[PDB]
Amino acid sequence: GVGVSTGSYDNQTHYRFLGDGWVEITALATRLVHLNMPKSENYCRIRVHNTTDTSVKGNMAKDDAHEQIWTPWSLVDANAWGVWLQPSDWQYICNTMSQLNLVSLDQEIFNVVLKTVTEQDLGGQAIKIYNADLTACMMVAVDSNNILPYTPAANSMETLGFYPWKPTIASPYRYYFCVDRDLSVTYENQEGTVEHNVMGTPKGMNSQFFTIENTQQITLLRTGDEFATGTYYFDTNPVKLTHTWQTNRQLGQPPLLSTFPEADTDAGTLTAQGSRHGTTQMGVNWVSEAIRTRPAQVGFCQPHNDFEASRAGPFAAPKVPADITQGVDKEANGSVRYSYGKQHGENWASHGPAPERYTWDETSFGSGRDTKDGFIQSAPLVVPPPLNGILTNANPIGTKNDIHFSNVFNSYGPLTAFSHPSPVYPQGQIWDKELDLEHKPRLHITAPFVCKNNAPGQMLVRLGPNLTDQYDPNGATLSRIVTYGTFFWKGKLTMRAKLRANTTWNPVYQVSAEDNGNSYMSVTKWLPTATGNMQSVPLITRPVARNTY
């Protein structure tokens, strides 16, 4: 019966060369989970409306107004790149493979353990004794139908542990609910307090209330039991593991050289700009590397911080990340910044409520934008740019000295061509469910991989309520015995990938680990300390160069 293990531990990564350039990469990961008896006995509809910031006229973005539904269930969502592969492995993949895609994924729950804690006074004190409870049992449920709201573990940065030899706690489950929130616009110190700023009441046309009890077949398992899910397959497309340098400037045949450098110092020349073959979309009688027509448009100008408001409230309109270029425009290009914890990658030595943060910059040098160079010219395009026949990033547009065309320009056209957001090894979101809309987006910023078919299905889990000797629902007396649980998790994320070949003469950039020093690629960064503290920093994704034409 009970008293024997029901699984095996294995957190490695095997590489099976299928030849022909393709290799099947199977990533196995096992971790120990720690679940505590949920405080919320039943489903709660807590309404959070921060006014410590929303009330202020200056603060607008700090609007955490919303009404979620806290459920008594946790969640085992290991949708993180660092919770599958190993730090060293990712280096090999990015340096060799030129593309990768998800194939299958399985899960298992063995060695389920449930114990109770009681108080025991020792010498006047009160130490806690831990006694195992065999009769105790937990509850597991894998909603493969996705009947419940999809809640990415990476979107809240609360996935599983990235450290094999270290336990992890399952993040509670909760989904948003229908609530009409409204907030007026106020700059610095506008005349009078903020106009409107109130929460909303439950509507009957958008009232979405679900229950884990009626949305999945809960499988009860004790100490001697074990659970396992089927082999789910992904239909997502492969994501390139290389960056693009070619910009709209370099594409077709370069201008014919009329002069050849005599020394390694000077350079060559071109042909008469006025008298030179080529194609320009201007009625002028001259061409250049700035007016020559191109096959398409590499990258596009995106509205800088375009806060759009809706019935749910004001929000930051997402924007496809891209190279920062020499303009050093991070927030302008959409460079996403993260904030993870200790159980997610931060050094265990940095004691404090302040989590580590980093700004990820894309490697798509081709679609890079530069606000310090963007401009427009009058219809009658003339060489000499008139003082009024041009709009540079310095002309106050809209009675504002800080609001120019760049902050409100969408160059997205039928010629827009860009790459995918390079997925980060640590705290990186792998797959994601597609939106239930007639016309879903061409891609997702949260995760490179988007399940075209159905979604994997979040895995829910809750501890079985251990009632006491006395109980009475009508008396609001929910006497529960202090009980917790610790079950193991075993998953295998099989995925194939293809590797590129050396088609160049000059060695391509790689990801190496320099000696212990100021160098970012320091070994100590991923090496234990005298005490045992460790940290997981982001890795250079898409190191190899890729020609875009």
Add this chain to the structure above:
Amino acid sequence: GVGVSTGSYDNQTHYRFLGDGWVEITALATRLVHLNMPKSENYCRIRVHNTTDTSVKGNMAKDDAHEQIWTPWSLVDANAWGVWLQPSDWQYICNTMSQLNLVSLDQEIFNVVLKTVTEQDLGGQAIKIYNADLTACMMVAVDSNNILPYTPAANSMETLGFYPWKPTIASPYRYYFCVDRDLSVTYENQEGTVEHNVMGTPKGMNSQFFTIENTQQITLLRTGDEFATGTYYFDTNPVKLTHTWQTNRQLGQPPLLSTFPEADTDAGTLTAQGSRHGTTQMGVNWVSEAIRTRPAQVGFCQPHNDFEASRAGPFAAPKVPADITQGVDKEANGSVRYSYGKQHGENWASHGPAPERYTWDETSFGSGRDTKDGFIQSAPLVVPPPLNGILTNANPIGTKNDIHFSNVFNSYGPLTAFSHPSPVYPQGQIWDKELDLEHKPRLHITAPFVCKNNAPGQMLVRLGPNLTDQYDPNGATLSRIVTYGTFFWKGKLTMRAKLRANTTWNPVYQVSAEDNGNSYMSVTKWLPTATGNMQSVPLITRPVARNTY
């Protein structure tokens, strides 16, 4: 389910005569292991740098500078001759068999027991109560791939118990790490303090960090479970169980006797040294038992205490052990000295932190060296040794009265011929993994047997972490329930061996046990005391004589 044994105890030794002179010796050994919950929750990179000795100018050898990686895993490495066979058995083997080699080896883990301890005040005190925890489970892993650094249990003298009726604790696991240590040379009281003496920082080209969690398939087993490994086979070569007396002096045909002893007192003579057939490598016109050419070179002069330094720091250059001869040169011949504990062979009555030690002297009388007789002569070899035409072990070489040629001479040549280091019964290292080098050494001093093929694979083991009711990784709160474990071990080291025959007229030396007295081979040495204390002293290896030509 749980509540029943899962193995059998057997610590005997059977002899199966396969005839033809060969006999298959199967050695079974079972012991009780005691494992405690490791203090280090995670992998630590502790840096130990003793300065209480390194700082001093005189102390140089006492350099314990290094940086290891303490892992939360123990190790069940029973690589000891005394932890397999019985004291009496070894006597029979060495006295009969003339050679022995390793064949197979298996292991098993039954009757796994895990209990927790809690405090319970008794009459104002605080006695500890022990309650068995069924839900509790341990973890076992046999890295047969040797992906992790090989850590011999005999190299640290922390193997299993040599006493069947007495439990034993598994020695923790830990491997060295890359660290550049440097130490200057200082004699007695040199001018000024020691020049350089600092530790090093982690390098990126030699950063070797491994994890038991990602280097082997951990098998979880509870109280009712049991583990067993496959039948590993050894490819090592057989080691002779005999000593060599013949020296470079006696080999071919002895000088013709011209005179025959008339009485048992006087002796015979030879032929005219000037007029006598023979072969000498000298241009002289005479021969002798000192200049006659020999088939090869028996033994060789080895650098006495040649401390060589490297990026890791100064160390004592190993040297193949050999006979001490009449020169009584122990440290000069490489006579290894040991230091074991009570659970390893020391008398349990000798209470104190001082462990027993003994200097092992080889039995290879043929390759014995004598510093009190070694010398060299000028090229023009002449009978009368000039005062300047000879270099005895008394000529100050290098402005030093204690540093002669012997202390820095390597006579290792294409004619060097020697035997193997006689393995000791107690605390003796059996097998050992070969170095991952293009040109590995002809042999190992640590263990006579060297796995030509892959290594056996150290057996790791750790207790399952029993979490408490409350837990939070981010709060540095690793509340663990006091828990320990006691599992049994069963192993069978099958090995064949051949026995020699009486080919002489005069009885060969044997290993007997003289009556209780000053005699080293005293019976009381291996006999229990009034209290029950016992000790295991080394045994005479290679008692039988062996002709080397």
Add this chain to the structure above:
Amino acid sequence: GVGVSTGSYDNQTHYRFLGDGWVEITALATRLVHLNMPKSENYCRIRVHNTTDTSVKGNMAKDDAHEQIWTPWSLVDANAWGVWLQPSDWQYICNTMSQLNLVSLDQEIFNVVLKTVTEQDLGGQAIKIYNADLTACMMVAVDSNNILPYTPAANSMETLGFYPWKPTIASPYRYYFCVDRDLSVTYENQEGTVEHNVMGTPKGMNSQFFTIENTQQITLLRTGDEFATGTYYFDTNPVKLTHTWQTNRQLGQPPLLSTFPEADTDAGTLTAQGSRHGTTQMGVNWVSEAIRTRPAQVGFCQPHNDFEASRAGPFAAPKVPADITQGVDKEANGSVRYSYGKQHGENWASHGPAPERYTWDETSFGSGRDTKDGFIQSAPLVVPPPLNGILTNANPIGTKNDIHFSNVFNSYGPLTAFSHPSPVYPQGQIWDKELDLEHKPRLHITAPFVCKNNAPGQMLVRLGPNLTDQYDPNGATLSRIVTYGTFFWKGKLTMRAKLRANTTWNPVYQVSAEDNGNSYMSVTKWLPTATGNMQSVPLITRPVARNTY
């Protein structure tokens, strides 16, 4: 798994009549055993040398000088007649059967229980709580090879319980060791203290040290496990269950009667002693019922208290028991006296350290000796016994008035004929291992049955050491958890036997149970008391008469 019995209780005796006069008697016996964790963690070589008596000049026999080896193992040796059959049964066997022999014997160990005890203060006191420990396990081993010294449980009177409804404890195991003990001879108050009286040191030619760990396959069994041994067969010969009355006086044809009794008072006469046919070994011209030659010699004079000394020390030379006759010579005929305890047969009401004792007298009336009648006569045998031509038991032989020929005469000759020692029901030794000697004795006094083939094989047993949370062999810290065990024992001693027939006219003596009175065969002797106390007294063995010619 655990929580269910593994055997059955049965302590009866079935009689299967195989006809033809032979009957197969199967004796089943089951008892509850109580084992405690041995105090001696390891093998001890305790040396016991009592001087409180040996020092005295008068005391010589009280020499308990010896050096045994106390092992941490107990022993389940049920070699007792009272631990197999029932009190009433033996009566039927001895009264009916005329001979019996051992055939087979099996054993079993079911319902193994191991519990631990902890201290728990109650109202200021400290009562002991008993909690069962499932993970706990014991160790069993049946050395059927007899590699270890044979230790009869009856030789120390420490067998199992003779009471079915009452538990029993297994007697610890221990064997003698080589030690040269020497003691001088001193009478009453000899001139000066005793000469020599010292113990000895371990010798190398007789050092016999064995270990249960390396002499048998220990079978580990927990609470849900059970052990059983094969069906061992005995090769011993059957022992007659009858006594002999015929003495050397009555054998062949009685003297011819010349006179016939006229009345039931007077008797008849013989023929002229001088003129009567017959055969005498005397040169005289007359015969009588004292000089007539006989087919052989019935019984023989044995040295009375012949204390022979050896390297081990002085000891009492054994002597074959026999009838005491009218001489009332008990110690002279070898009448063995016993000393048993309460768990062996003594009344539980007789509180005190003084055990019950009884002197067993043989039933072999034929081989009975009488020191008050033994004598010798000069070679020239003459009717008138000269004062110097005869040696009666009153002539001081050896300057001693108490040392006559009888005390030092061995009449054992090629004509010596005697019976076997009648085995006692209570505390009687059944079988015994033969001595490993070229010429073993014709019989054993300890047990009537002597295994001609190999021995049954003592059954050893020890409780599994339950280590604590903390442990360290080198620190002499052997912290063990207080634990004990209680396992059941089931054995069946199958043995066939033949029954005699009524071939006489006069009713033969039988064994009856007279009413409650001074009569030895009282029923109350084997009947419970008001409190429940009981006692087991010896039974009349060989009640039926047997003609020896």
